[PDB]
């Protein structure tokens, strides 16, 4: 678990983030293909996050799913951080989105049981997550999903609401519920092409969230309709449990995975 620069060789951007930019990279030794996320102590300490991402390597140390990305280890230099990652060919499920517009039933079907499997080996271990989007979605060589970022991860303003629950925007006490929320938010964005709260603002889509409001285009089927409307309840106690969703008759029909 000792590394240091000099045994990566680094290739071309994968992408260009908030604190850093993340590259291709090979273990010089092995010859390993990996992906190598560089962070600036700069934009860190700055913003007063350098005890989180503590806690969120240490984390996402111990966790090993086929559905959830790894991390090998880490290090630090001078003024960088460097995390050690899988690297996913296939890209983020954001790029895949715009390139095509919309999923069908099927690939949709299949994403979110993939996502209720990881969930609920989280959930064993009192693991959670604040939000789930598309742009921290990365696809395997065989197209299989897999969650790269916890974000606040148990074991003014800078954010989004787009993605985040009622209960958490209003100050309440969250439990796992959360995650069903984001099923919700996400079988929507899957099928629709854009996430159901959107607006222009973010005063706006603060009342829609808290609110409730979404409307479903003509072409959304009435099966889609009833999981979608089960998972966004005000309520948190309303929502199912995970193995009820992988139950869903129109999950077990359009799904390609077991449960
Ligand atoms: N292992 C990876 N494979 C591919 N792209 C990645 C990987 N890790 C991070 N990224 C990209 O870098 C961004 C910053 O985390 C992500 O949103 C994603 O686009």
Redesign the pocket.
């Known amino acids: 678990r000792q590394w240091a620069l000099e045994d990566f060789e680094i290739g071309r951007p994968?992408?260009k983030?908030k604190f850093g930019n993340?590259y291709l990279a090979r273990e010089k030794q092995s010859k390993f293909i990996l992906?190598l996320?560089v962070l600036f102590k700069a934009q860190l300490e700055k913003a007063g996050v350098e005890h989180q991402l503590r806690r969120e390597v240490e984390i996402q140390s111990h966790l090993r799913h086929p559905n959830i990305?790894r991390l090998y280890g880490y290090f630090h230099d001078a003024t960088r951080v460097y995390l050690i990652?899988?690297?996913?060919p296939l890209?983020?499920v954001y790029r895949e989105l715009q390139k095509l517009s919309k999923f069908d039933e099927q690939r949709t079907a299949t994403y979110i049981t993939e996502l209720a499997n990881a969930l609920s080996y989280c959930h064993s271990k009192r693991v959670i997550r604040r939000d789930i989007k598309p742009?921290?979605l990365?696809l395997g060589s065989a197209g299989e999903l897999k969650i790269?970022?916890f974000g606040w991860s148990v074991h003014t303003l800078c954010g989004t609401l787009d993605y985040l629950p009622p209960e958490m925007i209003e100050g309440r006490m969250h439990d796992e519920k959360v995650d069903l929320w984001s099923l919700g938010v996400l079988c929507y964005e899957f099928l629709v092409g854009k996430p159901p709260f959107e607006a222009n603002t973010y005063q706006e889509t603060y009342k829609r969230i808290s609110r409730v409001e979404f409307t479903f285009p003509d072409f959304v089927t009435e099966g889609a309709r009833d999981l979608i409307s089960r998972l966004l309840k005000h309520n948190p106690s309303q929502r199912p449990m995970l193995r009820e969703v992988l139950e869903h008759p129109w999950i077990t029909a359009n799904s390609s995975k077991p449960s």
């Open positions: 994968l992408g983030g993340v992906a996320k990305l990652l899988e690297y996913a890209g983020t742009e921290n990365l790269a970022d």
